[PDB]
Design an enzyme around this catalytic site. Structure first.
Site, PDB file in Angstrom:
ATOM      1  N   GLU A 157     -17.223  -9.079  14.932  1.00 27.79           N
ATOM      2  CA  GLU A 157     -17.069  -8.951  16.626  1.00 27.79           C
ATOM      3  C   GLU A 157     -17.123 -10.569  16.830  1.00 27.79           C
ATOM      4  O   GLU A 157     -17.763 -10.795  18.121  1.00 27.79           O
ATOM      5  CB  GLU A 157     -18.453  -8.342  17.393  1.00 27.79           C
ATOM      6  CG  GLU A 157     -17.867  -8.004  18.689  1.00 27.79           C
ATOM      7  CD  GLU A 157     -19.189  -7.120  19.330  1.00 27.79           C
ATOM      8  OE1 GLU A 157     -19.395  -6.041  18.701  1.00 27.79           O
ATOM      9  OE2 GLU A 157     -19.526  -7.454  20.475  1.00 27.79           O
ATOM     10  N   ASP A 179     -21.676 -11.191  17.012  1.00 27.04           N
ATOM     11  CA  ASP A 179     -20.866 -11.471  18.556  1.00 27.04           C
ATOM     12  C   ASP A 179     -20.843 -13.061  18.871  1.00 27.04           C
ATOM     13  O   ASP A 179     -21.137 -13.495  19.957  1.00 27.04           O
ATOM     14  CB  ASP A 179     -21.638 -10.799  19.412  1.00 27.04           C
ATOM     15  CG  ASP A 179     -20.410 -10.191  20.901  1.00 27.04           C
ATOM     16  OD1 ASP A 179     -19.425 -10.898  20.861  1.00 27.04           O
ATOM     17  OD2 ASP A 179     -20.814  -9.205  21.537  1.00 27.04           O
TER      18      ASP A 179
HETATM   19  O1  LIG Z   1     -19.455  -8.873  23.438  1.00 27.22           O
HETATM   20  C1  LIG Z   1     -19.060  -9.828  23.894  1.00 27.22           C
HETATM   21  O2  LIG Z   1     -17.956 -10.701  23.214  1.00 27.22           O
HETATM   22  C2  LIG Z   1     -19.781 -10.561  24.829  1.00 27.22           C
HETATM   23  C3  LIG Z   1     -18.538 -10.920  25.881  1.00 27.22           C
HETATM   24  C4  LIG Z   1     -19.134 -11.810  26.833  1.00 27.22           C
HETATM   25  C5  LIG Z   1     -20.421 -11.944  27.347  1.00 27.22           C
HETATM   26  C6  LIG Z   1     -21.464 -11.584  26.292  1.00 27.22           C
HETATM   27  C7  LIG Z   1     -21.018 -10.890  25.192  1.00 27.22           C
HETATM   28  O3  LIG Z   1     -21.876 -10.410  24.220  1.00 27.22           O
HETATM   29 ZN   LIG Z   2     -18.357  -8.992  21.639  1.00 25.87          ZN
END
Ligand SMILES: O=C(O)c1ccccc1O
Ligand SMILES: [Zn+2]
Ligand SMILES: O=C(O)c1ccccc1O
Ligand SMILES: [Zn+2]
Lengths: 351, 352
Positions: free
Chosen positions: A10, A300
């Protein structure tokens, strides 16, 4: 014992020429002390984030467009051009690191046939591993049209995912328009991970479930981040309500409704990742419901820090193993579930 | 190991003169085979639902207006009259069963001072035990104006809750207006318990948290149904994001933000109920985070069946006891947490 060769999927980027658009995301999601790192990471797939991934035992990173990305581009022709440019860009970047990088297609979701064609190009010509789409596609001359993918015209797209045998990652996006104004203006710090993101994704994937998408396409594979976007804590309540109310009510009207129990879809069609949810206790609860083979490690980045997400999984190896059912389960979540799901060959540190 | 004397406090009614409005709720929330029972229960606080409560070991039922109730009445003057009529009606109904019935105030939430006065009247003059409000107050054409209670003008209302020392139960309500059209028209069966309800309540109570309501009013008491409306599963993620992003970002701008960790508020200001969430596994997870002392049994009648909710808690007593940490924890969740929170005296089967 911690492991190397973890798969992380992700991980977002943006086109470097749109660096100015990333400052806007920084004002929603990035504390001041983290701004320099965010700007370097989001605009450089092969920069410090790769060095941190190597240091912290990631073997394979799958990159995707950040949010909303194409889903925020309301003019169809511009949106389609942007998605293509995103895919050509990341294809060029990962080309020099084939043992440790892959990509998900960015898509314009204004038109099911066009999105199907771009996914096909990414998979079959560029080797991409799936699609990542940031929730509803916004459209119209004012941006209020909300395009959901649980309506029948999207069947040609789901058939393409099944034909290509690649998964669809349903990622969150911020509120737009009247929804932003009415419900978030007075609580702007709730835009993003605190609640708004999962509120949207859970609505959309439950929409796919109750409108029968997985009944018509039992082989379709969907990925949700953030350990399932509020749904696992509500597994009992949602299924109970479907049994007590929704299924007999829909049947009495002749309305389409999901044919199987909620957990069937989460045990056959849906995979969860640990993106932004470095929680051993929440992970344990999810494993107990969907199985250790259905949860994938992820960070992430760049909204989360690679050293923090890997630090959680690596430094707490013994406790996580105890929570998820032993050494094999721990290695499955870290690496081997994704290795098998994406049909990855040998890759960096994969054995 | 089951118990009698259980307290159940997310139990809804509607004014009998608005029986026709209950048909609209039935089309959203009630399967055909359950319509006859729903209509009898929602309009008769002292009818068969009381016989079922007596049979199934409920000692005290706290009644509240159903949803949206006043929060769907978009014209302030009509809304205020309706809320008053609800409170006078249910006060009259519970008068004949004081050992096993109480009530939460229905409120018009168009104006903080007016809502404060009606709450005061209910508590001081009618003996009510708190307020139950169905999420944001709607106003404007089609309800498109969303009035949230986490903005500064509402401190006058929170101060009244603290003055009276009664809790505020923040209950869900359906979508309105453009949100209903844009986001639910193509997935209408997700209106209600499947997702829309908790999406709204979690946004609203997290709004109270991040706007500092519980920092300015540390004695304020809030109740959430349905084991916390998605929040417990996200306890780690929300607090992590507040630490990593929100709190330093707000501080750099001089913006108000929650001073304490998320779990502080869920261990000091907020209680959860088991309404519509007869899940031993989810209950266990919640107990592990907020403590067995902060979770209250409840059914959510008439949308849930009393025999089903009490059946879960009674028939699985041994397994639930093991999951929540023993006999005291089980009796605390069933009865004694609510007995202490609402200062209930002796009541029906209260020492069972
Ligand atoms: O899950 C994401 O890519 C995300 C995007 C913007 C801000 C916080 C986040 O976790
Ligand atoms: Zn994300
Ligand atoms: O929880 C409730 O009282 C409720 C209200 C409206 C619809 C469905 C419900 O469960
Ligand atoms: Zn209820």
């Amino acid at each position: 014992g911690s492991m190397r060769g973890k798969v992380s999927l992700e991980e977002a980027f943006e086109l470097p020429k749109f660096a100015a658009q990333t400052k806007e995301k920084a004002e929603l999601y990035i504390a001041p002390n983290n701004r320099d790192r965010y700007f370097e990471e989001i605009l450089n797939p092969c920069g410090n984030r790769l060095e941190l991934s190597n240091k912290h035992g990631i073997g394979y990173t799958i990159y995707s467009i950040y949010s909303p990305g194409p889903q925020g581009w309301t003019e169809r022709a511009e949106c389609e051009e942007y998605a293509r440019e995103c895919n050509d860009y990341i294809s060029g970047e990962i080309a020099n690191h084939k043992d440790r990088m892959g990509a998900f297609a960015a898509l314009s979701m204004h038109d099911p046939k066009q999105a199907s064609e771009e996914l096909t190009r990414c998979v079959k010509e560029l080797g991409f591993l799936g699609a990542l789409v940031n929730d509803v596609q916004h459209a119209g001359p004012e941006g209020e049209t909300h395009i959901f993918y649980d309506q029948p015209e999207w069947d040609i797209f789901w058939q393409t995912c099944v034909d290509l045998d690649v998964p669809f990652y349903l990622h969150p996006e911020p509120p737009f328009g009247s929804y932003l104004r009415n419900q978030y203006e007075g609580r702007k710090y709730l835009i993003g991970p605190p609640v708004s993101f999962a509120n949207g994704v859970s609505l959309h994937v439950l929409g796919m479930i109750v409108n029968g998408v997985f009944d018509r396409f039992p082989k379709l594979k969907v990925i949700l981040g953030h350990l399932g976007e509020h749904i696992p804590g509500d597994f009992w309540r949602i299924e109970h309500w479907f049994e007590h109310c929704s299924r007999p009510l829909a049947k009495s009207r002749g309305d389409v409704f999901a044919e199987k129990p909620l957990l069937h879809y989460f045990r056959n069609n849906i995979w969860l990742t640990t993106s932004g949810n470095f929680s051993t206790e929440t992970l344990k609860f999810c494993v107990e419901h969907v199985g250790a083979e259905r949860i994938l490690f992820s960070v992430d980045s760049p909204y989360e820090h690679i050293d923090v997400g890997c630090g959680w999984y690596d430094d707490n190896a013994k406790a996580i193993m105890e929570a998820v059912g032993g050494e094999k389960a721990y290695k499955d979540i870290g690496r081997d579930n994704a290795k098998k799901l994406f049909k990855l060959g040998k890759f960096y540190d994969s054995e």
